[PDB]
Design a protein around this ligand. Structure first.
Ligand code: NAP
Ligand code: NAP
Ligand code: NAP
Ligand code: NAP
Ligand code: H0V
Ligand code: H0V
Ligand code: H0V
Ligand code: H0V
Lengths: 252, 251, 252, 250
């Protein structure tokens, strides 16, 4: 029987690339999504056309709230409903936008709920549910950020969320090791730039990258995820692999 | 004229020692408290006996909620009301207890308390503090030297303290143009929990290379005092460990 | 045509496993050794039995001295003379023993051996490798140590050498990225214990490891080296991958 | 009786500021120097004018070699000879220059100088200090930019990483003797004499806190704090003094 994986925010971009590669490797996948229903279903369709009954979609908002625990529990339950098991959890879904300290129409309470909920609290609750539900190679991969110690100006809540995720990666690695669940991270530097970013600003980032003066492809991020879930990483837990082409080594 | 400082969770233990030391250095102080009103007032009485009208108390829950932003604005406002300025913010108040991943507060309440006290309130207080400055201004965050070798079953607490490291660095970067420095002090074993059994306390004391004892609250406060002082005017985004070498000790 | 790799200190234990896996992946190999001639030759013969003319040995002391640069240049030269190319350098060879700060080798010899093997020889080998390089996938992998921030008592020079090696990994990643040469590390926690060590002392260490209460095999260390040199790590440079079973996350 | 401190490379710049502050704080000082004989002597004169018999100079090359251990021992011995005690060691002296990986000093000499001054000598000085043994401590001058290093400074950066390692390993090992071991890590402080002014201003402009370099005295302030009674529980810590520079992305 084939192992099964949950990938959060898997409709597009890096999350899709992770779902696709896990699928090519032989996993059945839960494609979690929030607003991108059309893309999520189009992805599932494609994967099912390749091997029938190997992909399902699963909608959930991962903003922090009193029901987020139930929503995270239901994501994991959806993987067991569809496939009878859940071997791998990839925490990819993430809000990312500035929250200047000194001054959209979002209240600060909402910005906290979204940026901290998606980047940290949902990963934690999903980790709890994943572990509670449990030959085998169980693991969790958290999508981190190589630039958290040299952060972009005015992104303090986003940065707080990614740091917390480093913390979860370490605490969970420690706590879940006795269950054979490994917990690791992958830290992109610049990978796929925001759709709203203009090409000139993209190029400015690209030129900072020592290894090729270009951003990581979605696939290059996915390759590191696939390593960490594989039997080639069976002694690795609590590790965060930078995939940044050297960006984080470059001084101001 | 005397500068003014806000210390969160200042009624007892390390926050009290920080408040006392700031006051002894010439600061006027806001003593924030949540449940410890009797202690906050007894401290303020003691400080005001030394110098009249140099200590006030301020009550607030720092649990994350819809009203936390307004509570944090008011903490900063209370300093401006009492003393006409706010030069120093010390983020010390903190919830601390285990949140096991695998199995009573509900988990969503644990998130609100642990992530609210250790990260979100410091963020909001940081915003309010800076907004009122939109001179030697600084913020000191009480961090934790053991965040990379955390105690078992303390995920949420650890997440909170890691977020606090992120805020320290992000805010140091962003508030530098205002001359507001942002730094941290990271204790290892200092005052042990009142509820911890005596034998467990000695087990932790025995691990500390430098003296086989915990840090006093005053030794923690000493690093805070350095960081707010004129001797640290080029230091921002720095977290000073005060741990007697504990974090260097392998398993 | 087959790529070629230099592995230092490859006669035994981790280095040998690295050489074997590289060879199994399709690399021709230079097996560098210092004192272990028989084991080095035994390995070369075994690999050449698999595929003729794909393994050579190279003898050299990597202790710091006036001749260390020429020795390192000659190691790299040996790979070019053997195979016409040198795609991968693995800095594995390492002296390891206590050097207490307070009171039969002299301290100047301890400095030379521990700092030479763990840092200076890697640096010199890195210069010589890059100098000879000024669809290729060139890279360097340094064998670091997951425990450098929680070091064993009385191992200061060894620890200093390994920290220096982290600095080299970072500095060389940055400086060699324009040449397409990636530079990374693998940081074991407890892997193969010293051959003399009593089982009872081995067990004290094994029991500290969250993930399975056992040390890493040489092969598990080699797996991470294989990933870093592979096509799946082509955006990874300046990264150190802990392979430690969560050991470094465990407080005193 | 007043405590005594050894400060390496104390004739100029940051080491000088540290020696001056220690002395103002009540220490007798050994002013170590290599080539700067004239500046060393002049500092000792200035300090002894303020308090007589409270400063001496001590000459030593801290390049790695087989006699470096003897030289390091002699620096510590000079403190005991002059003052009968040695309470504080500041490891400040340091070579700093590029050593590109791809092509008048030989590489042998570059390794000796960069690794000797930044790492090996601090190690040997630490050994001799401890062996000859109150508020005893060591402060190592580290570098806030070690994880975002200057291009083509691999040996220098290797030396400074090793120095972090020494700081940690020695804090651990010397704690049973009450000797604390800490670091201070500048970002941009006094720029090289040889650096052009255009390049100096390029670096200044990168510092979030004031768009200026640290003064020597601001670096010395952090050293003074770590040797002080206000840092009695602090060991194995490295205090960045960088105005936020290391937080700034490329
Ligand atoms: N791109 C980079 O250069 C880069 C750099 C560093 C780190 N990373 C990390 O790598 C991961 C992937 O990056 P990316 O650029 O591919 O991410 P992305 O496109 O910004 O976001 C991925 C998905 O997150 C989901 N998401 C957002 N808010 C959500 C909410 N409230 N509830 C549930 N889901 C939500 C969205 O799902 P819907 O579309 O379905 O609404 C979105 O498709 C992220 O964790 C990111 O922080 C990326
Ligand atoms: N003690 C140690 O060994 C140690 C080690 C590492 C780090 N630290 C850090 O150092 C700081 C002080 O440590 P400590 O041991 O002195 O702290 P503590 O005694 O555990 O807590 C300090 C105060 O935090 C306040 N607080 C807790 N929950 C709150 C809430 N929901 N809203 C508002 N205030 C709340 C409480 O005020 P009321 O009493 O008024 O309710 C409490 O007195 C903390 O940030 C801690 O994480 C301490
Ligand atoms: N084993 C572990 O648990 C562990 C933990 C952390 C890190 N590591 C790192 O992983 C790597 C492999 O470890 P290991 O346990 O396999 O190493 P090892 O067996 O101690 O040493 C490997 C080889 O290093 C060579 N070597 C020693 N001194 C040398 C010199 N002066 N010149 C030239 N070569 C010299 C020796 O070659 P000859 O035999 O030919 O003389 C030896 O076989 C090392 O870098 C080590 O520091 C290992
Ligand atoms: N300046 C900065 O921006 C900065 C940034 C990061 C870290 N730091 C660190 O802070 C410390 C002080 O910086 P700095 O700029 O003041 O240092 P510096 O002026 O570059 O060097 C200090 C002294 O080191 C001594 N020295 C050099 N080579 C020597 C050798 N072979 N043997 C003995 N002594 C030798 C020299 O002594 P003589 O003059 O007597 O020959 C020199 O006066 C250094 O460790 C440095 O690495 C400085
Ligand atoms: N959830 C999420 N997190 C992210 N970190 C991103 C990015 C980062 C793109 C970028 C990476 C480095 C510098 C400037 C921009 C682009 N889109 C993102 N989405
Ligand atoms: N808010 C808060 N945070 C904390 N980190 C603490 C402690 C920590 C006590 C302790 C420190 C190190 C190991 C084991 C226990 C005791 N009381 C605390 N209160
Ligand atoms: N060159 C070299 N470096 C090493 N770090 C080692 C070891 C380490 C074995 C060990 C690893 C962790 C805790 C206690 C012992 C065993 N043999 C080694 N050889
Ligand atoms: N021994 C020594 N070490 C150093 N690190 C320096 C410096 C550093 C000046 C500088 C600091 C940051 C970027 C570029 C230059 C200037 N002079 C120095 N001397």
């Amino acid at each position: 029987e084939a192992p099964a994986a949950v990938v959060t925010g898997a409709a597009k971009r890096i999350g899709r690339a992770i779902a696709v590669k896990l699928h090519q490797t032989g996993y059945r996948v839960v494609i979690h999504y929030h607003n991108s229903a059309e893309a999520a279903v189009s992805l599932a369709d494609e994967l099912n056309k390749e091997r029938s009954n190997t992909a399902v979609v699963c909608q959930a908002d991962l903003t922090n709230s009193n029901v987020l625990p139930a929503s995270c529990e239901e994501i994991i339950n959806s993987c067991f409903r569809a496939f009878g098991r859940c071997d791998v959890l990839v925490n990819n879904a993430s809000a990312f936008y500035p929250t200047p300290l000194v001054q959209n129409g979002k209240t600060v309470e909402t910005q906290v709920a979204e940026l901290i909920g998606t980047n940290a609290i949902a990963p934690f609750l999903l980790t709890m549910s994943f572990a509670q539900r449990q030959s085998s190679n169980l693991s969790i991969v958290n999508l981190c950020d190589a630039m958290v110690d040299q952060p972009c100006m005015a992104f303090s809540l986003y940065n707080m969320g990614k740091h917390a995720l480093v913390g979860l990666t370490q605490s969970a690695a420690l706590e879940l090791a006795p269950y054979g669940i490994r917990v690791n991270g992958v830290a992109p530097g610049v990978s796929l730039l925001p759709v709203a970013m203009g090409e000139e600003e993209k190029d400015k980032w690209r030129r900072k990258v020592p290894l090729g003066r270009r951003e990581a492809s979605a696939e290059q991020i996915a390759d590191a995820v696939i390593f960490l879930v594989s039997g080639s990483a069976q002694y690795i837990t609590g590790s965060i692999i930078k995939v940044d082409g050297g960006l984080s080594l470059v001084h101001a």
